[PDB]
Amino acid sequence: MRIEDKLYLNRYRTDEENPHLKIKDESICAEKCSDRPCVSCCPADVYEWTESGMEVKFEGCLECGTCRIVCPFGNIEWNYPRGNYGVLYKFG
Amino acid sequence: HANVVVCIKQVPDTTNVRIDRKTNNLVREGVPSIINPDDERALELASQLKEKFGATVYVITMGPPQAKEALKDAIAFGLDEAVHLSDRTFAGADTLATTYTLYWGIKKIEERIGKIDLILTGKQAVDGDTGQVGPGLATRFGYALGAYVVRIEEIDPEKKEMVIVRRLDQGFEKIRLKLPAVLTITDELNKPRYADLPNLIRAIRYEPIVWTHKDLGLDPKKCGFFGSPTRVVSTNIPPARKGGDIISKNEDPEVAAEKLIEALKKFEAVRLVEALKPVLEG
Amino acid sequence: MKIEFDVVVVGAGPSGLSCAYVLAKNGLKVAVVEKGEYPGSKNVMGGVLYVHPLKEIMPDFLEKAANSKALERNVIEQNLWLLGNEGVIKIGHRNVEWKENPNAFTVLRANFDRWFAQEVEKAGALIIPKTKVEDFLRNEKGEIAGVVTSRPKGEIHSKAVVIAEGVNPILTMKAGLRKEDLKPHMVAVAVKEVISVPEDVVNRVFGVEGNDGATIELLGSWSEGMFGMGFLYANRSSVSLGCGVLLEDLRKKKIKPYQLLENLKNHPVISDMLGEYRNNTMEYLAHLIPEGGYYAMPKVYGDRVLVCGDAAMLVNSIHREGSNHAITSGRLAAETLLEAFEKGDFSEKILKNYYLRLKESFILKDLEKYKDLMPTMEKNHQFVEIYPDLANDALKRFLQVDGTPKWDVQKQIADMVLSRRSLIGISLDLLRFWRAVR
Amino acid sequence: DLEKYKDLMPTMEKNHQFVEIYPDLANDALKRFLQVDGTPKWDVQKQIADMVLSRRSLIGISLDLLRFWRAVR
Ligand SMILES: Cc1cc2nc3c(=O)[nH]c(=O)nc-3n(C[C@H](O)[C@H](O)[C@H](O)COP(=O)(O)OP(=O)(O)OC[C@H]3O[C@@H](n4cnc5c(N)ncnc54)[C@H](O)[C@@H]3O)c2cc1C
Ligand SMILES: Cc1cc2nc3c(=O)[nH]c(=O)nc-3n(C[C@H](O)[C@H](O)[C@H](O)COP(=O)(O)OP(=O)(O)OC[C@H]3O[C@@H](n4cnc5c(N)ncnc54)[C@H](O)[C@@H]3O)c2cc1C
Ligand SMILES: CC(C)=CCC/C(C)=C\CC/C(C)=C/CC/C(C)=C/CC/C(C)=C/CC/C(C)=C/CC/C(C)=C\CC1=C(C)C(=O)c2ccccc2C1=O
Ligand code: SF4
Ligand code: SF4
């Protein structure tokens, strides 16, 4: 709600059929992870840990790369979106 | 082989062109201009018509000098040629003025390849979503207008006649169009391809054929603000909708259901539903 | 049909286009592959771009970029602000010879790299946007012989491949370099806002006029005790306000890195400057800044492959010289390949000269200097936690006139500084940082 | 306040350095610190030292910081 007000300002070409943020193992995010640093350090609120699993709202991804690096267990299959997709920064 | 001409329009990216309430204007500065998304389906159909029947597809745009980058993004689909109608004689044009320029733009294309067997436009541009250029272009040429195309069945290149599925409000309808026709493509026809590199690299080092108002031979004041009958006198953003009120609550388990139909009938628009007349008329 | 090129430069940032500028000016069929819609579409930078690494690339750079919208508000004043609870210690330096011999311009990188792509295109390079490189096509010798893309028929053949793709070294790890991924101490999460401030409040709050710019560097307790160097730059009709903090500090604080930008907007001083021009945010960005440097960089060379820019982790983030290092690294890689093209050898015997040019120039000497800089800043948490808020209350007490007889303000400052930290902590910390500055 | 800065201007009269070299040297040092010209940041940390220890010796800099310390008490 709060940061998706500011993500509305950015320009995107969303690739909804190709999620570039896949989580390799959902069970590592349930019992192996304690603090979930992918949620607390994502500048775009992409990751939200529900009890249904991890909700990865990849459409707002700013392609920074923090989630892949801050994740201690490596279970974020992180790619850039394809060419002409993802954030399209105007006056970046 | 057929001759296809795809009239595309460079449109600002209206997914990002948003309303700023505090300046009360469209914040469309910095937002790059793209193909009209109704025309990416027209270009993808034209590239399908090029790999199935070998139709020489041209793409034409009457726009600003910055609209040569939209004409290069159309060559990435695999198209043969792009044509730019770039002149500020054409600036501020309306639909009658655009169609008069586009009729004489395609008429010069007809002096190069032959009589145009098919004209593909989009259903609407998004800036000024009128959608009358496609209908207007079928009248200048005297071509069969198949508008709001959702499917393409038999595109018989031997009988010079194809079957489309036009969407109307009572339902879709199959139509045996007679070529030469002017189609008008919606979003639901196809999904545009991810372009390959040999066409995208060719799209980068491509220069669209620029034609001014002297190149076409048209009347010098039948195309701009003078050939425009209508005049846009004022553009103004809409209001901030209208604050509502929690008709029901989290207490009423269902008693909120008739309180919805209580407060539906206070609105004018429920006459328009075509299925809530037995609760409004009675 | 084979798409044949001489060099393929992956990435169209500062190091990608400066590498492609020298190859295209020297007559090489060089292709640039950028995964954005235009060059600059994925690039985040607050803006201070220094004109000397570009006057080595383009000696007529300030004439070509004056008419355009690439550059933005020539930087004549560089401030450093120590934000307190309510005060600020501005330590600026305005120089007026920077008005006619410029040192730096503020930029917006979608406006700069789109113009810089147009000069690289005029130089003779084919810039291919909307195209992400996935891996490298290899010959049976096992070396990088080109580039495969996400496009359907996408396989670009080249005698060399320049991996100028910035931070997130995804493509560097495919080339065998970067034997591990980035750990969250080699990078800093940098969250930036571009705020629309209408061209005359920019003149008023920065103390400038008429395409002359000022840069603020913000320190204080808005960064929650972590070493975050925020910034506040003057664009033409805008203000690019952002903040960057290390990932190790951000992970163990768990505070959502746009909140630091909200602590930076809602400071009493920044909310005084931009009063209600704070919430007309035009854009919200996020990126990473390489901060490991010398201890964390890859092998920057290989068989038919070079690595420039942030992909080689060449960033002096304490001086904010990353584009300074990137545009130079493109020039050193392109001059290495121009040696490689007259000899025809592209292996590690000739392409090791790029690593020799990288340490004979300023790029690796700035990395050796601030090598143990952020591990020094991580083992205090004092220089941005007590030290700005104490220097603000001391200088406020120094300027407050309340009938206190100036010896009892010279000792109330001493009772201020030797209460939040002992004198064995103050005199230690001045030279404990001296080892970080070398 | 008068006893504190009692011997303040006789201290300032017997230097003529704090407004004669000291501002113009702190300006050329901070300009060299912010100037980016491809100089590898050790050769700007020593060009500042070659700036400060050329207009006044180090026996004059470290003396003048506490010679004024007697003026500020
Ligand atoms: C706020 C505003 C309101 C406007 N209102 C009107 C109005 O009420 N009536 C009116 O006639 N004009 C109007 N115009 C101007 C009008 O858009 C131009 O005359 C233009 O030529 C028609 O574009 P359109 O929005 O009608 O698109 P449409 O006609 O809906 O576009 C349909 C298809 O026609 C083709 N096409 C459209 N424009 C071009 C072009 N320039 N070159 C080539 N092919 C093209 C494309 O394939 C496109 O997908 C308005 C403009 C603005 C800014
Ligand atoms: C908030 C912030 C502020 C900064 N401020 C300053 C400053 O004031 N001064 C300064 O000197 N430096 C500054 N920097 C640093 C500067 O942005 C970088 O150090 C430098 O500009 C990066 O150059 P690059 O060539 O690596 O380009 P990058 O922008 O890092 O990336 C190059 C390009 O590679 C492309 N790419 C990536 N992967 C692929 C792929 N697989 N296929 C194809 N293309 C790909 C991307 O689209 C990108 O455009 C700042 C950085 C940040 C985050
Ligand atoms: C009479 C005279 C002595 C008055 C003193 C005034 C004094 C404050 C400045 C001039 C004195 C000179 C002679 C000192 C020599 C060494 C100087 C250059 C040390 C630099 C540290 C500070 C004080 C710089 C001034 C503030 C402002 C101009 C900074 C610009 C903003 C950006 C570009 C710089 C970022 C930056 C910051 C924020 C650092 O904290 C830091 C710490 C250690 C090394 C480098 C840096 C650094 O580059
Ligand atoms: S960090 Fe790795 S483990 Fe912890 S939650 Fe995110 S993904 Fe699951
Ligand atoms: S990339 Fe940056 S934004 Fe996209 S998810 Fe990982 S962290 Fe959140």
Q: Which chains touch D (3 or more CB pairs under 8 A)?
A: C
The Å distance, Cα C85 to ligand 3 centre, comes to 22
Distance in angstroms (rounded) separating the CA atoms of residues B155 and B178: 10
| Cβ–Cβ below 8 Å for B197 and C1 | no
How close does chain A come to C336, measured CA to CA in Å?
A: 29
Structure tokens at C56: 């080595």
The Å distance, Cα A51 to ligand 4 centre, comes to 14
How close does chain B come to C337, measured CA to CA in Å?
A: 24
A29 Cβ below 6 A of ligand 4: yes
- Closest alpha carbon to C81 in C241, C217, C231: C217
A56 Cβ below 6 A of ligand 4: no
Q: Which residue of chain A has the CA closest to B15?
A: A11
| Cβ–Cβ below 8 Å for C184 and A35 | no
Distance in angstroms (rounded) separating the CA atoms of residues C245 and C259: 11
Distance in angstroms (rounded) separating the CA atoms of residues C355 and C298: 11
Pairing label, strands B172-178, B161-167 = antiparallel
A89 contacts in C (CB within 8 Å)? 36, 40-44, 109-110, 283, 285
A76 Cβ below 6 A of ligand 5: no
Distance in angstroms (rounded) separating the CA atoms of residues A47 and A67: 9
Q: In whole angstroms, what separates CA D25 from the centre of its chain?
A: 7
* Structural Rg of chain C based on CA atoms: 23
**Ligand 2: which of C116, C260, C289 to mutate, most ligand atoms within 8 Å of CB?**
C289
- Domain of residue A15, CATH code: 3.30.70.20
Distance in angstroms (rounded) separating the CA atoms of residues C38 and B81: 23
Distance in angstroms (rounded) separating the CA atoms of residues B8 and C91: 55
Nearest by CB: B200 against C1, C128, C282: C128
Q: Which residue of chain A has the CA closest to C250?
A: A41
Four-residue CA torsion sign, C163, C169, C171, C175: positive
| Cβ–Cβ below 8 Å for B30 and A90 | yes
C39 contacts in B (CB within 8 Å)? none
Structure tokens at C423: 């004198």
What is D24-70 written as a DSSP string?
A: HHHHHHHHHHH--SS--SSTTHHHHHHHHHHHS-HHHHHHHHHHTHH
- Closest alpha carbon to B120 in B84, B154, B64, B79: B79
C129 contacts in A (CB within 8 Å)? 83-84
CA atoms within 13 A on the CB side of C203: 7
β-pair partners for A87: A12
Tell me the residue range of the domain where A11 lies.
1-88
The structure was resolved experimentally with cryo-EM
* D62 CB-contact burial (10 Å; exposed 0-12 / middle 13-18 / buried 19+): exposed
Hey, whose CA ends up nearest to atom 6 of ligand 4?
A: A38
Hey, whose CA ends up nearest to atom 48 of ligand 1?
A: B122
How far separated are the first and last CA of chain B, in Å rounded? 60
| Cβ–Cβ below 8 Å for C151 and B205 | no
Q: Which chains touch B (3 or more CB pairs under 8 A)?
A: A, C
Nearest by CB: A92 against C44, C151, C189: C44
Distance in angstroms (rounded) separating the CA atoms of residues C227 and C221: 9
CA dist C119 → B207, C31, C106, C380 (Å) = 17, 14, 19, 46
C290 Cβ below 6 A of ligand 2: no
- Which residues have a Cβ under 8 Å from the Cβ of C432 and sit 6 or more positions away? C376, C380
Pairing label, strands A86-87, A12-13 = antiparallel
How close does chain B come to A8, measured CA to CA in Å?
A: 8
Nearest by CB: A66 against C129, C238, C247: C247
Pairing label, strands B181-185, C7-10 = unpaired
Buried b (16+ CB within 10 A) or exposed e, C5-44: bbbbbbbbbbbbbbbbbbbbbeebbbbbbbbbbbbbbbbb
The 3-class SS string of chain B reads: CCEEEEECCEEECCCCCEEECCCCEEECCCCCEEECHHHHHHHHHHHHHHHHHCCEEEEEEECCHHHHHHHHHHHCCCCCEEEEECCCCCCCCCHHHHHHHHHHHHHHHCCCCCCCCEEEEECCCCCCCCCCHHHHHHHHCCCEEEEEEEEECCCCCCCCEEEEEEECCCCEEEEEEECCEEEEECCCCCCCCCCCHHHHHHHHCCCCEECCHHHHCCCCCCCCCCCCCCCCCCCCCCCCCCCCCCCCCCCCCCHHHHHHHHHHCCCCHHHHCCCCCCCCCC
Q: What resolution in angstrom units was achieved for this structure? A: 2.9
The helix/strand/coil state of C9 is: strand
Binding-site positions of B: 7, 9, 36, 39, 62, 93, 95, 98, 122, 125, 130-131, 133
Distance in angstroms (rounded) separating the CA atoms of residues B7 and B212: 17
Q: Which residue of chain B has the CA closest to C156?
A: B197
β-pair partners for B182: B119, B145
- Which residues have a Cβ under 8 Å from the Cβ of B13 and sit 6 or more positions away? A11, B31, B32, B33, B34
Q: Is the peptide bond before B180 cis (omega within 30 degrees of 0)?
A: yes
Atom of ligand 2 nearest to the CA of C36: 47
CA dist C321 → A27, C13, C47, C115, D29 (Å) = 42, 14, 11, 21, 19
B18 contacts in C (CB within 8 Å)? none
Distance in angstroms (rounded) separating the CA atoms of residues B122 and B41: 8
Hey, whose CA ends up nearest to atom 53 of ligand 1?
A: B128
Instruction: Suggest the residue from B15, B69, B72 to mutate for an interface test with chain A (most A CBs closer than 10 A).
Output: B15
Q: In this structure, are residues C21 and C123 in contact, taking their beta carbons and an 8 Å threshold?
A: yes
- Asked whether at least 3 C-beta pairs link C and B within 8 Å, the reply is yes
**Ligand 4: which of A25, A34, A76, A77 to mutate, most ligand atoms within 8 Å of CB?**
A76
- Closest alpha carbon to A41 in C264, C232, C288, C379: C288
Count of the separate structural domains present in chain A:
1
Crossing angle of helices C362-369 and C353-360, in 10° steps, is 60
CA dist D69 → B202, C311, D12, D13 (Å) = 74, 50, 11, 15
Distance in angstroms (rounded) separating the CA atoms of residues B201 and B8: 20
A75 Cβ below 6 A of ligand 4: yes
Structure tokens at B183: 């189609």
Q: In this structure, are residues C262 and C339 in contact, taking their beta carbons and an 8 Å threshold?
A: no
Distance in angstroms (rounded) separating the CA atoms of residues C229 and C243: 6
